[PDB]
Write a protein that binds this DNA or RNA. Structure first.
Lengths: 701, 511, 249
RNA sequence: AGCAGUAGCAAGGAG
RNA sequence: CUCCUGCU
């Protein structure tokens, strides 16, 4: 007898039998080895989509520049994707865009944007992902690379007194005007670097492999920028963020109901609607930032004078960015015994030891190679402008050709749903080929392999498959239920918070919540080696619980991490376990657990089990021990400044003078205020005064 | 306040990266400030329409939904790390103090007599027979001396490879030679295999009840109010009372205990080879017992990154005749006789080398989280049914409702087996566990494209006249990612049989 | 006499050579980016290393003097509790945690901890005194709103709360004097009568103020009445295909 | 050998 | 010959 699960779909919908077709219970795919061929595929395919050969020589950079606007070599194979944008066409779509809603639209949204730019402190830069530190040429978190950048500022010339966004940006351009910049290398020597190398290094973007992505056979390369490119991109993403928040054809469940319900009221006696789910392919290789420069020169053709000059720098830095080339490749003999490693530096000299595919990719990228990097001039990689291409999507979806056959829909990052209204099917060929025409002109390439349509709502948007009446829900990530691993107290309630927030937003029917609740209980007990008292587990932690259980009067007041059973349920996922067990505890047990005088807690739930495990042991055995000396000195100085200001973790400590002078001013302030209403003693005031004066003479020296 | 720091090099930079019909940024800004559109836009639009050559493809006239190309080549072998269907286990009553896995290994060394475990040095088939023979004798006397540390001999130095890696020489010294040590690089891709025929028997075996009862160590039930907790508790009791009996639960507990023990031994002892049992724990006639399926040997893992691919050696206990088609990577030896009272049938020792990884542990060791999509699916079925009837019909709906599965082998046209809904959740936990085993790239891309074809079948079910623009590259992308994973090829075959069953009523397909 | 100790610490930390290039060179805001120096990359599997930690025998760093003041070296059958490997900080096992939790001294701190978490005890007090009814099994759904979800009685807007704790706990470098003070300064006159003499540290007090005064407004799918009494029970009252509410009072 | 899947691991580094 | 690791 044969067997087939998909027969469940013979008398059901795809709103119920679609969680059957997500393989989220298994391991995600990982990358291996170098990430060189993916980067060469991205850049080589980007120049292969250029549709031109017109090169312009450069005087700043020693390599040629190929332009990407208005120089088209129209091959007959137009079904292949193009990377050329016509600027009068898209500016015509912008002038057509603002004439639909309001008159003073871009001035309004841009004035609100600048109203949020000037009131921004640059610690917002430290709330980001990993970036590329150019001092040691590595990947570091944001506060580390910003601290090394400001360290290069205050080491090179003068000090930094900005404490804003705009003065930091002007400090970046001031670094661009400098003829020589000194920084520190590794055991901390101090070196210098010239002017052109600083220009080549501020425009350096690191490439790597996207690890753990569900939905592709071939792996894809993601790129991370440095530090000096991030805040201008933050400015542009706030501007286009306000624009996308103001628009009404962008994204998620109500707007499709309003546009389907509204566009069903715009039908005549012979017209009808056909929707098409598409998927714009090669989206990261067909968005050139020059059109971002022209259109942001429209939205800042009418803003002001400062915002006009500040919103036109990050598209230039995307116009002449570099690309890191991974770390090379490996070679081996016929016996497969010795395997030499060739990095990205010596790839030019050892060109003749590669494969056929590698030489095909490498000889079409040779006239753009630097020593360690490559020169890309039209690409928009991952980890870049996301809320700005959506504006181009709405511009394609608000076209007016003048019948009464037209289209509308909804746009996402690279996912769109399109609705057409027409009378006959050859007219549908006319209108859809007009849509492929306007998207093909503007630089948006729809894939033909991954598109379809029907008459009613049976479409696909951001993995939500909308049928004619019902709504499919998003298949969530299963490992997100258990991600804490930090405490015996801040893991179970964190899991109940994840079940709660996945219950409110998604559907998440209650028996799944009880089942995953009991399963996360089971992995909690299995992780922290704690079992209930009536179980037959005999390890080094259940013997003590087994021997002393006679002292406990009421048995169900023990905590789960101490050998108690479960009392939380679905209707109490918002309340931690500790309070619902604090209404039943024994007085020796309640007075015994909740002592703050314990060797574990001294040296959001109730922290009575919070202990700190030992760290790793490559923290004092690698060559970067001086960095651990830096984190120890930083923890000492931060404990000093925290020791003076008794309440400093509540408000952000703004100020631009110095830290130690504010410390001495504060100890003199509380010395005088606590003097005259307080202390009063000559040895204490003159002795503390003597330590302040001697410490100020010591600090000045 | 309103002045940006006008530098010297950047004003030469922004003037360089303008479009081609412009000279400076100033001329570009003065044209963009005074831009008015025209109606020659439609001439460029229609001029883009004329040189297109693109037509849509309907389905009512040209229903070219052809079935997929299964590779008609050599049959794909059995590639799971353990044995599911062909297992044999020795039992004992479980002792509470003797609970650690080496204690279980020793107590099953006295319980199952390994003194009668005599193997010939000649296998039935395989590749290397002497190495596994001296390895089994060496680990058998090693468990006889009750210490789990394999002393270094040439057999373990050959199997779990010590020194089997290339000499990674950096490009600081290279000492080149005239036409000697000619080095380069080379990649191939993947090898292509064919349709497995044994997967139906392990499917039907894996969803059949096994007399040992519960297998998965679940937890206790929380107290219930007068709320809907009676409903969710009732569904947990019925569904959990169904999934605890099948062999899928035995495989899940096998992966949890076995890969848990190899996981903690990969943490506690790097650089030392251990001897780890392969076992379970389940209740028999009320008395909690434990099993013993096989013997595993670790390969001195120094897990630097999430990969690392340490060597696992599996000695296995089977009671069936081997197969040079299915059991192809194995090195089938033998054991002797086992008394099985229903007479004293044969007992075969199997051997296999394989590998695990550090990322391929935590998704196996925490594979208990498969009761979420099954209960989500059955719960959406029942809640959509009572949502469309608007009456509390749950406990009687779980018995008087059919589910069409498992068409026969000789004929397929509308010849289905309608089963009860708890057998449906049996098949759902089977297919979710098979998803948790065989996850590779090919399954992911094939799940994407079968979401597309499922959208086409739903487009067939209500007569909506779906359409596509280019079908050639579609079947080029589907047939690219169906190479050697047996679950993907099997689901492709069952997708083709889905089209053959659905072709009997709707008209969008082929024969 | 604490200013003398802070002067000893300040002279001791200005005594260092290369730390003179650390302070009086940066800014007051740089303390924030002096706080974050976590050179670990992502800690992308914390539960994995937590299971690796709890599987060892001595994973925990704990204080010496309290556990050598009250503890016992080994339990009654082979259970290790102590190490002598390394400041004076001693590595131990999780058996010492539960051993403190069953065979340790106790300090009466019930009323203080029952006064820290008054919002969550208010949640349990409102939860225990509710009543339910039957289910309905019907379709339901309505759009997403921005709802304040806590039964507070002050209803500040996440801006007068930080300013409030500045003008309650530490007023010496609190804030520039605004127009939002006066009635909240009568509230300063009420609130300084509460947090004046306590054994609770200032960080925990600044934690517990911000949970009795803040109506937490989030963007959630809501339906029915939008009373904040039934908004923390939003995940319990109704799902997608079912609905239950029979509360009389 | 094997794990693999478009290139890596099957230990490495220093004194 | 020894030391060190366990995301660098």
């Amino acid at each position: 007898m044969e067997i087939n699960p998909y027969l469940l779909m013979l008398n059901n919908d795809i709103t119920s039998m679609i969680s059957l077709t997500y393989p989220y219970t298994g391991a995600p795919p990982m990358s291996h080895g170098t990430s060189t061929k993916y980067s060469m595929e991205t850049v080589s395919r980007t120049y292969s989509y250029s549709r031109t050969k017109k090169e312009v020589p450069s005087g700043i950079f020693p390599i040629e520049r190929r332009k990407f606007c208005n120089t088209i070599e129209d091959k007959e194979n137009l079904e292949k994707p193009n990377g050329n944008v016509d600027i009068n066409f898209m500016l015509s779509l912008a002038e057509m865009l603002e004439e639909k809603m309001g008159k003073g639209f871009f001035k309004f949204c841009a004035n609100e944007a600048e109203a949020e730019i000037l009131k921004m402190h640059f610690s917002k830069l430290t709330e980001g992902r990993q970036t590329y530190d150019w001092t040691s040429e590595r990947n570091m978190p944001a506060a580390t690379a910003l601290q090394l950048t400001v360290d290069a500022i205050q080491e090179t010339q003068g000090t930094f007194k900005g404490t804003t966004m705009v003065e930091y940006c002007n400090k970046i351009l001031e670094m661009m005007d400098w003829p020589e910049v000194k920084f520190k290398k590794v055991t901390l020597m101090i070196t210098k670097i010239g002017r052109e190398e600083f220009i080549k290094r501020i425009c350096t973007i690191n490439t790597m492999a996207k690890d753990g992505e569900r939905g592709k056979y071939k792996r894809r390369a993601i790129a991370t920028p440095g530090m000096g490119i991030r805040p201008f991109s933050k400015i542009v993403e706030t501007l286009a963020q306000k624009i996308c928040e103001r628009l009404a054809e962008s994204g998620k469940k109500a707007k499709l109901k309003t546009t389907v319900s509204s566009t069903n009221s715009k039908l005549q006696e012979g017209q009808f609607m056909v929707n098409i789910t598409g998927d714009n392919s090669k989206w990261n290789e067909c968005q050139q930032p020059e059109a971002y420069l022209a259109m942001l020169a429209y939205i800042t053709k009418d803003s002001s004078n400062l915002m006009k000059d500040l919103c036109s720098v990050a598209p230039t830095l995307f116009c002449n960015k570099y690309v890191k080339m991974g770390q090379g490749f490996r070679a081996k003999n016929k016996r497969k015994t010795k395997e030499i490693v060739i990095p990205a530096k010596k790839m030019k000299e050892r060109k003749e030891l590669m494969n056929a595919e590698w030489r095909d990719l490498f000889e079409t990228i040779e006239p753009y190679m630097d020593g360690e990097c490559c020169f890309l001039g039209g690409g928009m990689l991952m980890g870049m402008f996301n809320m700005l291409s959506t504006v181009f999507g709405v511009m394609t979806l608000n076209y007016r050709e003048e019948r009464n056959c037209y289209w509308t829909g909804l746009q996402s990052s690279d996912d769109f749903v399109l609705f057409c209204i027409s009378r006959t099917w050859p007219e549908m060929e006319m209108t859809i080929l007009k849509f492929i025409a306007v998207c093909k002109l503007m630089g948006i390439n729809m894939s033909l392999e991954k598109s379809y349509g029907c008459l009613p709502e049976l479409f696909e948007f951001t993995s939500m498959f909308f049928s004619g009446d019902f709504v499919s829900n998003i298949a969530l990530e299963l490992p997100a239920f258990t991600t804490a691993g930090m405490n015996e107290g801040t893991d179970f309630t964190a899991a109940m918070s994840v079940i709660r927030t996945n219950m409110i937003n998604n559907g998440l029917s209650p028996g799944t919540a009880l089942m995953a609740l009991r399963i996360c209980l089971q992995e909690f007990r299995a992780t922290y080696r704690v079992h209930p008292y009536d179980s037959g587990v005999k390890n080094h932690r259940m013997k003590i619980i087994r021997k002393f259980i006679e002292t406990i009067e009421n048995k169900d007041g023990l905590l789960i991490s101490d050998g108690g059973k479960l009392m939380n349920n679905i209707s109490s996922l918002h309340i931690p376990e500790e309070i619902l067990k604090e209404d039943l505890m024994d007085p020796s047990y309640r007075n015994r657990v909740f002592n703050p005088r314990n060797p574990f807690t001294q040296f959001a739930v109730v922290s009575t089990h919070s202990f700190r495990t030992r760290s790793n042991r490559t923290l004092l055995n690698t060559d970067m021990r001086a960095m651990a000396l830096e984190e120890k000195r930083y923890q000492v100085v931060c404990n000093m400044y925290r020791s003076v200001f008794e309440s400093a973790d509540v408000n952000t400590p703004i100020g631009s003078m110095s830290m130690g002078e504010a410390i001495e001013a504060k100890i003199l302030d509380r010395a005088r205020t606590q003097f005259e209403n307080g202390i009063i003693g000559g040895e204490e005031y003159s002795e503390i005064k003597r330590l302040i004066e001697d410490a100020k003479r010591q600090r000045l020296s | 306040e309103l002045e940006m720091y006008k530098s010297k090099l950047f004003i030469a930079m922004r003037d360089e990266s303008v479009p081609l019909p412009y000279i400076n940024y100033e001329h570009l800004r003065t044209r963009c400030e005074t831009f008015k559109r025209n109606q020659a836009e439609c001439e460029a639009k229609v001029a883009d329409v004329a040189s297109r050559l693109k037509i849509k493809l309907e389905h009512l006239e040209e229903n070219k939904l052809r079935p997929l190309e299964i590779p008609k080549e050599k049959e794909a072998p059995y590639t799971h790390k353990f044995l599911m269907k062909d297992a044999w286990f020795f039992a004992k009553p479980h002792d509470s103090e003797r609970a650690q896995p080496q204690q279980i290994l020793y107590d099953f060394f006295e319980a199952a007599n390994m003194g009668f475990m005599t193997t010939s040095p000649k296998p039935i088939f395989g590749k290397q027979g002497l190495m596994y023979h001296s390895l089994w004798g060496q680990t058998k006397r090693a468990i006889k001396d009750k210490r789990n540390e394999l002393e270094p001999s040439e057999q373990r130095d050959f199997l779990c490879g010590i020194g089997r890696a290339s000499k990674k020489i950096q490009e600081d010294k290279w000492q080149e030679s005239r036409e000697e040590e000619f080095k380069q690089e080379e990649t191939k891709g993947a090898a292509k295999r064919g349709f497995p025929t044994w997967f139906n028997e392990e499917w039907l075996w894996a969803m059949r009840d096994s007399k040992i009862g519960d297998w998965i160590p679940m937890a206790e039930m929380p107290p219930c109010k007068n709320e809907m907790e009676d409903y969710a508790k009732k569904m947990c009791e019925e569904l959990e009372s169904k999934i605890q009996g099948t062999n899928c639960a035995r495989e899940m507990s096998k992966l949890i205990h076995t890969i848990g023990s190899l996981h903690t031994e990969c943490r506690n002892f790097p650089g030392k080879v251990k001897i780890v049992p392969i076992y379970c724990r389940g209740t028999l006639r009320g008395e909690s017992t434990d099993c013993l399926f096989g013997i595993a040997i670790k390969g001195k893992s120094h897990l630097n990154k999430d990969d690392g691919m340490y060597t696992v050696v599996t000695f296995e206990f089977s009671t069936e005749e081997p197969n040079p088609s299915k059991h192809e990577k194995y090195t089938v030896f033998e054991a002797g006789t086992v008394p099985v009272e229903a007479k004293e049938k044969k007992l075969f020792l199997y051997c296999r080398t394989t590998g695990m990884s550090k990322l391929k542990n935590d998704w196996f060791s925490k594979c208990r989280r498969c009761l979420i999509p099954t209960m989500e699916t059955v719960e959406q079925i029942v809640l959509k049914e009572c949502a469309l009837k608007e009456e509390n019909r749950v406990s009687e709906m779980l018995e008087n409702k059919r589910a069409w599965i498992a068409h026969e082998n000789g004929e397929n046209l509308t010849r289905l087996v309608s089963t009860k809904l708890k057998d449906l959740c049996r098949m759902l936990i089977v297919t979710q566990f098979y998803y948790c085993i065989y996850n590779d790239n090919q399954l992911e891309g094939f799940c994407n494209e079968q979401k597309k074809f499922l959208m086409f079948l739903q487009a067939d079910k209500d007569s909506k006249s779906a359409f596509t623009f280019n079908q050639k590259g579609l079947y080029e992308k589907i047939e690219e990612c169906i190479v050697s994973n047996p679950l993907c090829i099997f689901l492709a075959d069952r997708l083709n049989k889905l089209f053959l069953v659905a072709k009997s009523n709707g008209a969008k397909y082929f024969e | 006499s604490l200013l003398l100790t802070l002067a000893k610490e300040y002279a001791n930390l200005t005594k260092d050579k290369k730390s003179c290039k650390l302070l009086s060179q940066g800014t007051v805001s740089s303390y924030t980016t002096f706080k974050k120096w976590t050179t670990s990359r992502k800690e992308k599997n914390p539960s994995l290393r937590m299971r690796w930690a709890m599987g060892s025998k001595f994973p925990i760093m704990a204080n010496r003097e309290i556990l050598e003041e009250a503890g016992i070296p080994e339990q009654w059958e082979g259970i290790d509790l102590w190490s002598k490997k390394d400041l004076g900080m001693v590595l131990a096992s999780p058996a010492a945690i539960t051993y403190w939790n069953f065979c340790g001294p106790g300090v009466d701190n019930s009323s203080v901890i029952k006064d820290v978490y008054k919002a969550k005890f208010m949640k349990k007090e409102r939860w225990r005194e509710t009543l339910w009814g039957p289910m309905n099994f019907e379709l339901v759904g309505k759009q997403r709103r921005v709802v304040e979800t806590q039964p507070v009685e002050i209803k500040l807007n996440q801006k007068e709360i930080k300013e409030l704790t500045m003008w309650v706990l530490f007023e010496d470098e609190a804030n520039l004097a605004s127009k939002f003070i006066q009635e909240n300064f009568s509230l300063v006159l009420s609130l300084r009568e509460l947090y004046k003499g306590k054994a609770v540290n200032k960080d925990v007090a600044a934690f517990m103020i911000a949970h009795q005064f803040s109506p937490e407004k989030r963007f959630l799918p809501t339906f029915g009445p939008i009373r904040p009494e039934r908004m923390e029970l939003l995940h319990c009252l109704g799902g997608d295909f079912w609905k239950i509410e029979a509360v009389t009072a």
